[PDB]
Amino acid sequence: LNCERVWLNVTPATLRSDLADYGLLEPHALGVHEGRIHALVPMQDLKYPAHWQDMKGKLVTPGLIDCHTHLIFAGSRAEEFELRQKGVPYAEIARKGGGIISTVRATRAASEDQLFELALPRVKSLIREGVTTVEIKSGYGLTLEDELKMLRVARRLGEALPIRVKTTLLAAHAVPPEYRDDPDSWVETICQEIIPAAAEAGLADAVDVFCEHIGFSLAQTEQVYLAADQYGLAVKGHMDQLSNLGGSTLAANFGALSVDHLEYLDPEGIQALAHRGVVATLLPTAFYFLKETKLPPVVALRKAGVPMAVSSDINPGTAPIVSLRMAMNMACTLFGLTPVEAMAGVTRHAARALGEQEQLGQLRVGMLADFLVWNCGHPAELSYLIGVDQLVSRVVNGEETLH
Ligand SMILES: [Fe+3]
Incomplete structure (x- = not known):
């Protein structure tokens, strides 16, 4: 043999x-x-x-694969959460620094070594669950140096532990404070400096965007994708989570590896995804923690034959649960998936979502x-x-x- x-x-x-x-x-x-x-x-x-x-x-x-995580980050939003559960108005929480910005400030302030040390135990939980490949995103830095430092920690994790790591540059997760009144100049920094510097350093396997009303417009999203293409980087996107701006169709046109969340995905987007072979990634744990009620169009996606991946979406503010198996359980319970779909969702389809359909899953x-x-x-x-x-x-x- x-x-x-x-x-x-x-x-x-x-x-x-x-x-x-x-x-x-x-x-x-x-x-x-x-x-x-x-x-x-x-x-x-x-x-x-x-x-x-x-x-x-x-x-x-x-081996299991979870293609959508933000497991690198510093700070804690537990106290903020407690204030909310107690009845403190969101507006008050916000003016004192609550929200994603809170995670961004903590992460910018944390050193590369600290983020690595903070991420080690998180990855170890996935490892013992059977996760052999994990995708990790940037997006909590919102500056060239801080975005690249997150990508480096991600690279370090892959070298230090017996697990494969795919990095994704997600600089357009939100508009940093310094660009508050100039959302469009932040987009140019991404396209002309961050993506280029990331590519030159071989730190990003793909590029992602948070296309949403509280995020970036379809136009701003298109800008990034154009830049990513120039440096030969694969793309993907955070879309239809809270609203439909037509981002899913756009991603499909760019040959996006996958589109994530999809709570508000429409019939036209679905056709696009099916045709362009885009993977639809379901993030049930986020849906649960955010107490969302609008379900992603699972039935329509199935009828259209669009492969659905399932991932944890591990992140400080939306899905604070470090477990891929819990996500599988929730995909079945909350979204109606079958255990066999969930399994294919964390192997075959997750592999495709990371462009590794020929090597893993x-x-x-x-x-x-x-x-x-x-x-x-x-x-x-x-x-x-x-x-x-x-x-x-x-x-x-x-x-x-x-x-
Ligand atoms: Fe996410």
């Missing part, structure tokens, strides 16, 4: 695009070579070495060897039972990482 590492007797939920549901197969032997799945052979065709690990029929799935020969051996019987459990370590083996790039 011409490869150096082999797992015997694994029951694979391949999650192959061409196989129904979970793509579950009879017991197999999984061999890896040079960080890639080198062979998948039915145990019945075999009858070890000795360093060949026998999983004794335990379930194996591709499925147990196919030739793709990266990122998989997990669980102690639970069926993959449906991954969306059901939450908060319990259940990994027996976590392999990234062909290597055991659990120890």
